[PDB]
Motif scaffolding. Sequence first.
Motif, PDB file in Angstrom:
ATOM      1  N   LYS A  92      -4.448  17.756  31.624  1.00  0.00           N
ATOM      2  CA  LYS A  92      -4.401  17.514  30.176  1.00  0.00           C
ATOM      3  C   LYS A  92      -5.209  18.529  29.360  1.00  0.00           C
ATOM      4  O   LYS A  92      -6.020  19.277  29.906  1.00  0.00           O
ATOM      5  CB  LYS A  92      -4.825  16.070  29.851  1.00  0.00           C
ATOM      6  N   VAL A  93      -4.973  18.521  28.049  1.00  0.00           N
ATOM      7  CA  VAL A  93      -5.512  19.524  27.105  1.00  0.00           C
ATOM      8  C   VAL A  93      -6.751  18.944  26.409  1.00  0.00           C
ATOM      9  O   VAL A  93      -6.924  17.724  26.367  1.00  0.00           O
ATOM     10  CB  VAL A  93      -4.423  20.060  26.096  1.00  0.00           C
TER      11      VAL A  93
ATOM     12  N   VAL B 104      -4.258  27.032  23.397  1.00  0.00           N
ATOM     13  CA  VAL B 104      -4.621  25.669  23.741  1.00  0.00           C
ATOM     14  C   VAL B 104      -5.746  25.700  24.773  1.00  0.00           C
ATOM     15  O   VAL B 104      -5.631  26.374  25.811  1.00  0.00           O
ATOM     16  CB  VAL B 104      -3.376  24.937  24.279  1.00  0.00           C
ATOM     17  N   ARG B 105      -6.827  24.983  24.480  1.00  0.00           N
ATOM     18  CA  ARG B 105      -7.915  24.851  25.428  1.00  0.00           C
ATOM     19  C   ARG B 105      -7.489  23.787  26.407  1.00  0.00           C
ATOM     20  O   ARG B 105      -7.293  22.619  26.039  1.00  0.00           O
ATOM     21  CB  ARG B 105      -9.229  24.464  24.747  1.00  0.00           C
ATOM     22  N   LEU B 106      -7.362  24.192  27.658  1.00  0.00           N
ATOM     23  CA  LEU B 106      -6.712  23.387  28.666  1.00  0.00           C
ATOM     24  C   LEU B 106      -7.670  23.119  29.807  1.00  0.00           C
ATOM     25  O   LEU B 106      -8.263  24.046  30.340  1.00  0.00           O
ATOM     26  CB  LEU B 106      -5.507  24.165  29.172  1.00  0.00           C
ATOM     27  N   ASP B 107      -7.800  21.859  30.193  1.00  0.00           N
ATOM     28  CA  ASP B 107      -8.730  21.470  31.257  1.00  0.00           C
ATOM     29  C   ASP B 107      -8.129  21.785  32.616  1.00  0.00           C
ATOM     30  O   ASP B 107      -6.909  21.923  32.742  1.00  0.00           O
ATOM     31  CB  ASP B 107      -9.067  19.983  31.153  1.00  0.00           C
ATOM     32  N   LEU B 108      -8.985  21.894  33.625  1.00  0.00           N
ATOM     33  CA  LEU B 108      -8.556  22.342  34.950  1.00  0.00           C
ATOM     34  C   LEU B 108      -8.639  21.243  36.000  1.00  0.00           C
ATOM     35  O   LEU B 108      -7.697  21.046  36.773  1.00  0.00           O
ATOM     36  CB  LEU B 108      -9.384  23.552  35.366  1.00  0.00           C
TER      37      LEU B 108
ATOM     38  N   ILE C 239       2.936  22.311  30.007  1.00  0.00           N
ATOM     39  CA  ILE C 239       2.094  21.240  29.525  1.00  0.00           C
ATOM     40  C   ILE C 239       3.087  20.254  28.935  1.00  0.00           C
ATOM     41  O   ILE C 239       3.815  20.616  28.016  1.00  0.00           O
ATOM     42  CB  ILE C 239       1.105  21.679  28.413  1.00  0.00           C
ATOM     43  N   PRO C 240       3.149  19.029  29.471  1.00  0.00           N
ATOM     44  CA  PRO C 240       4.004  18.011  28.900  1.00  0.00           C
ATOM     45  C   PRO C 240       3.219  17.115  27.950  1.00  0.00           C
ATOM     46  O   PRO C 240       1.991  17.039  28.039  1.00  0.00           O
ATOM     47  CB  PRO C 240       4.446  17.233  30.125  1.00  0.00           C
ATOM     48  N   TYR C 241       3.947  16.451  27.052  1.00  0.00           N
ATOM     49  CA  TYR C 241       3.370  15.581  26.027  1.00  0.00           C
ATOM     50  C   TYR C 241       2.269  16.267  25.240  1.00  0.00           C
ATOM     51  O   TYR C 241       1.203  15.692  25.013  1.00  0.00           O
ATOM     52  CB  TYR C 241       2.826  14.300  26.655  1.00  0.00           C
ATOM     53  N   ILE C 242       2.519  17.506  24.841  1.00  0.00           N
ATOM     54  CA  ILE C 242       1.553  18.235  24.037  1.00  0.00           C
ATOM     55  C   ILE C 242       1.504  17.681  22.608  1.00  0.00           C
ATOM     56  O   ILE C 242       2.523  17.224  22.079  1.00  0.00           O
ATOM     57  CB  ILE C 242       1.849  19.748  24.028  1.00  0.00           C
TER      58      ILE C 242
END
Lengths: 149, 129, 172, 144, 257, 146
Positions: free
Chosen positions: E167-168, E159-163, E146-149
Amino acid sequence: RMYGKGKGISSSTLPYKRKQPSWLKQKPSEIEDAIIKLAKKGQTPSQIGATLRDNYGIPQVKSVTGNKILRILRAQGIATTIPEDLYFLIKKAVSMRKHLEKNKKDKDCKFRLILTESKIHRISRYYKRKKLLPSNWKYQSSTASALIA
Amino acid sequence: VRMSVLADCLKTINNAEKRGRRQVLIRPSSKVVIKFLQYMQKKGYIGSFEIVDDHRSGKIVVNLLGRINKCAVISPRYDVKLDEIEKIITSILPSRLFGHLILTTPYGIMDHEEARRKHTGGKVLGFFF
Amino acid sequence: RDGRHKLRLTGGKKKIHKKKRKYELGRPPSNTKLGSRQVHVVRGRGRNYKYRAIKLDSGSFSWPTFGISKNTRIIDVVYNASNNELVRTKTLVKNCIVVIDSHPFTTWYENTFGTTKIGKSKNIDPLLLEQFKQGRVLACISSRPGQCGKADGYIIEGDELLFYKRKMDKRN
Amino acid sequence: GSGKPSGLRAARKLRIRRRTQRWADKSYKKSHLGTRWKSNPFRGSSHAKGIVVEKVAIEAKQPNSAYRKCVRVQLIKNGKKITAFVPGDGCLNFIDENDEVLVSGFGRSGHSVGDLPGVKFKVVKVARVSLLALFKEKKEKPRS
Amino acid sequence: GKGIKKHLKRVNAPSHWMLNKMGGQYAPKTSSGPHKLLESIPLVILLRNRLKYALTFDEVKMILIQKIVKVDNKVRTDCTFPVGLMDVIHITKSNEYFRLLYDIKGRFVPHRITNEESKYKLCKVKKILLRKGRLSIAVTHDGRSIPYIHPDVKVNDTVRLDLETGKVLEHLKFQVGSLVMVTAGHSVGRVGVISSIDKNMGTYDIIHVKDSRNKVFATRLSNVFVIGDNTKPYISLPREKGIKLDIIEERRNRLKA
Amino acid sequence: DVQHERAYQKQEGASFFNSKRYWKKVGLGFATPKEAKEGVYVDKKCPFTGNVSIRGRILKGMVISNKMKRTIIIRRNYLHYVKKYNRFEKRHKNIPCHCSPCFDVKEGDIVTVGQCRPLSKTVRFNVLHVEKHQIFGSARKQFVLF
RNA sequence: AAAAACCGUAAAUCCUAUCUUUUAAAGGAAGGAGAAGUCGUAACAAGGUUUCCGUAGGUGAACCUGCGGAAGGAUCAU
RNA sequence: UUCAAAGAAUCAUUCUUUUUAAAAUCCGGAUUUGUUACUUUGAGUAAAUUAGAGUGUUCAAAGCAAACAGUUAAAGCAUUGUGUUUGAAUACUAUAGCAUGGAAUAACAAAAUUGAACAAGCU
RNA sequence: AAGGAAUUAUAACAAAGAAGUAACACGUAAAGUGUGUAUCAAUCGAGUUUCUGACCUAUCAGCUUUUGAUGUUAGGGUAUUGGCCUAACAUGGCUAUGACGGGUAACGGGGAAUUAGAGUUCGAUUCCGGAGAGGGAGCCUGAGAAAUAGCUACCACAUCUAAGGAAGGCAGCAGGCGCGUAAAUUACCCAAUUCUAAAGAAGAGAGGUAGUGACAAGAAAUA
Ligand SMILES: [Mg+2]
Ligand SMILES: [Mg+2]
Ligand SMILES: [Mg+2]
Ligand SMILES: [Mg+2]
Ligand SMILES: [Mg+2]
Ligand SMILES: [Mg+2]
Ligand SMILES: [Mg+2]
Ligand SMILES: [Mg+2]
Ligand SMILES: [Mg+2]
Ligand SMILES: [Mg+2]
Ligand SMILES: [Mg+2]
Ligand SMILES: [Mg+2]
Ligand SMILES: [Mg+2]
Ligand SMILES: [Mg+2]
Ligand SMILES: [Mg+2]
Ligand SMILES: [Mg+2]
Ligand SMILES: [Mg+2]
Ligand SMILES: [Mg+2]
Ligand SMILES: [Mg+2]
């Protein structure tokens, strides 16, 4: 007994009461002074104690003075470099060696000399383990004679 | 020479019991020995005992109820885990129903049953029947 | 060859039970010299190429005081704390003291301020200055030319320089 | 006192004495000395095949009185000459003076058995037919 | 010659595959991928031994060939692709959505799930690299970068992460009272609150996790997966809800049926 | 005399010319001694002053030797349980450790050593903290359970 | 590209040396088994010189003798 | 070298609560105090084997399956369509290493031809 | 911004600097894919490495060090650490808690047998690890081999040859001789289990199925 087959139990055994008895008049300072004097006069710890017991009225320097007699000697600074018992042993060894030198065929003496040497080495070791002897101190049969003084 | 005061004391006690004495002079008292004696008393095997204070290692004299069959030390105080206990007790003491196998345990000295109840095994001092 | 085949510290013979596994590779030394540049590529493990410089000259040399660097022909090797044989053979390694054709640094200095980004205030040693006057200056190598394939180095300075001079010392 | 040390940290002595002493046990020594493989005809085996060299009689131990019928055979494996007693009421003649005999132990590891002096071996097959079978006879007949 | 091993023997297969001793000599050997073979599970097993949609490897392969099974929303045709702890599987024809979770035993169940909740997935960060241009990138247990977290994200937290998009959404710190799932030893299914973290100097940071029967159990911090704040889990847990019962209790439960 | 070798003993990680001598903390609560922070001496394999990070095991020992240059031997004495006899037995193992001259260590002194990379054919350890201690026989013979 | 030279890995062959392991040998000298063989009678009884020890010399053979020990003596004893 | 003491429950015993010193820490109240052995809890370990739970492979050795409802539908649950419940536990994985509660038992360290604790003063 | 700890991530300055960032192929999905590609991380791993743990032997007591034994320095080399190798300098290191030798009819472990409990023996052999492909040694390719159904060489075996040359390595599967007390078919198939591929669709003596089989193990007629 450490070396013989001796198994005797002849012993001093001190009395139950260890706070000094009523009849003892001597204040501690005086007794300390006396002890010091005795030490100066050439007596060794045990001998000093004996003298105190006999000539003066005092059973145990530990009951009159909180401290034991060696401790007080140390405090006063007249403690021997070389501890009592050890010194005595060394003396004995020296004597034995002289005899051997004189008189070569004495086997029993030689045997006993070995025993005394061994005992010295034990005692010596013990003292080293504490700090009464320095670690640089072997006991030598050559030197020994000079050491005692 | 002495090594294990406690063992010697126990032997003496056993001897006394065998003779059928009543009183018995356990000659160097020790905290551990005292504890052991107390434990014994608790489980009935011994009567009163008058730890006499000299100004040295004390003497105990102990009052016997004619009740002990044997008591003993098991030298090498083997560390013993809680699972390892059962086999040891089987080996030693005459019945599962009685006798006691005394452990020194970080919760003081106590018998095998006590240890089990607690959870901790420890080093194994001795036993009686 | 990087491996066992060696006594056991107690001085017992390790009876060998294993060939030589390629990942115990001990490929042989590039005695890299002066000359016109010439470098081969040896293919280390995961296609990780490394550059066996075998002849060299024009390494990158730094001047630590001012924290700058310049590419210069290197004109001679003069000391080797490993062994004198290497210096005799003029072989460059990772702590060889060598002589740089040191006009470049002087030129740079001239360009910047005076004549023999800018935290200037230090303003040069005496020994170094003297060295510069002849054109040619002592300098460590710092790359491992045999691996990296460049004779990158730096100018020797103050205390270290003095020490090296002493070592060099001539005398008889 | 016990004899043995029973210290908590005594284990070294305890192990070591046992290790040295084991070797006094005869059986253990027999098992673990290397001379087993060297000084044994079968060379650590159940049976062995030997061609016969001599049909021979062996007089029994003093109290009993018989001449027991043995066969002095050469092991093919080892090149060892050994006497092997042949069982059966009349089973010496069931074998030939040169027959590929299969010989077993007698029942007592190396140690010799019964009336026989120093015959530690029991032939139990000749030309691949079982000596027992031949003795019974209802089962088999020696092929040659 | 000697290099890596391509095969996996069916007994040497990790128990929570629950393979047979019979029924084969070998096991599937998860492809390299986003999960550690000992805590993953290949797609083959899912298709064949868990859902039982396939009887054989062949059938699984056939299924894969139709580009219909998605794992984290992008398709996979690799039969032995490793699926692993949290990952949503979208079998397209049935319109089934699974999310892999743990049972109260070690075992993977496929959980079954709604369209709406399917669109995200929890992911625990492991490392948080700095890279070029002083940009920070988190690295999840999903082997995903995950970049730019968001800067407040720290090394252990989920981290709840979208699919649909990389992005998160939100992040859940590794707090003293944070709803947690486990993913390794003994207490694997277990779900608790956290009482305490030890934070040993050179060693593994052991943590203690109070359950909802108030049975405390410890665990390495390594293998703990943050799943909520003290109140509500951010995912649908299985029926048991991570309540590893005692053996006796379990037996009683079984009996009462 | 600091510069004793054929090479200049420098101290990597020093930074001489620019900036506002080099030592580090080593961690696990082992206090960098005064002699590292003060007191010049260059050591490539000092835990504190050099470039080796201690990591892995930490084990206390008791020095047997100072004879090597900046390098020490420590026998660990310990008890191997033997289940047959349910008893123990004194056993030992001589770990060679790198020292670094921040620690003046005569024999019989207790030390604790961290791991670190392979520094030589056998020395995989370096001494982080030196307790004093006194010994009377030979260190060789002192069992100190630890 | 062949070919060559130098380090460096270094097979193999030969020569020693050492060690290990089986293995031959005139003769020597033990052992065990066997056979009612020869010569004695050593031991067991105070075994017809009590026995036995260590040591030394002797002698067909068991054995004998010296010296000092022991009772496992044939004496718990004036 | 801190021994002990008192209260409540149970069938003389068991399990529990409370305090009896000194120092540091926290807003008169409240809470940290040698090292290691030993022990207790954990953690972390491949399965196969082993012990062991479930399961009538016809039994059993097994295996890790299965059970349930029906001459073909009810019932459920899903918004005509969809079988359902599940199981493949648990313990064993040293004698070392990891963390961990510890009062006993062991060691060792601390400790007087002198050793350190404060209050004042000076640098 | 971490990590117990940084000469870490990273940022700047001065110098060099590889490799790369599609001159490719489908026609796909609800604009996509395949192939390739720099760095990073993950993963499948690998190498090293810490500690602890082994059988018999003292009729093996001193070993190791010119030939790196132990260390320090500098290097070389390696993917990286390291006497791993070189040079220079120390004189170390191990050992009666058994070093160093010798033996093992020794691969290690998970385990097996047998035990009330201890234990004793076994563990070639279903899994993990190591090693080896007649014997040593040496390389090439490649991410990974010091590969052996790769190659070079020597030794030891040995096959064809028109005598010039040539190829060959069952400790893969069967099968054969030998050795032996001692051990199965030159079988059928990729259906299952898996692997490899340009990855349903092909291959696989991996693997499975039968054949031989009184190795063991279970059930069970002969009323
Ligand atoms: Mg004595
Ligand atoms: Mg007496
Ligand atoms: Mg190989
Ligand atoms: Mg007469
Ligand atoms: Mg006669
Ligand atoms: Mg007579
Ligand atoms: Mg005469
Ligand atoms: Mg005569
Ligand atoms: Mg050299
Ligand atoms: Mg072998
Ligand atoms: Mg095996
Ligand atoms: Mg073999
Ligand atoms: Mg062959
Ligand atoms: Mg090869
Ligand atoms: Mg082949
Ligand atoms: Mg070949
Ligand atoms: Mg074959
Ligand atoms: Mg057979
Ligand atoms: Mg297939």
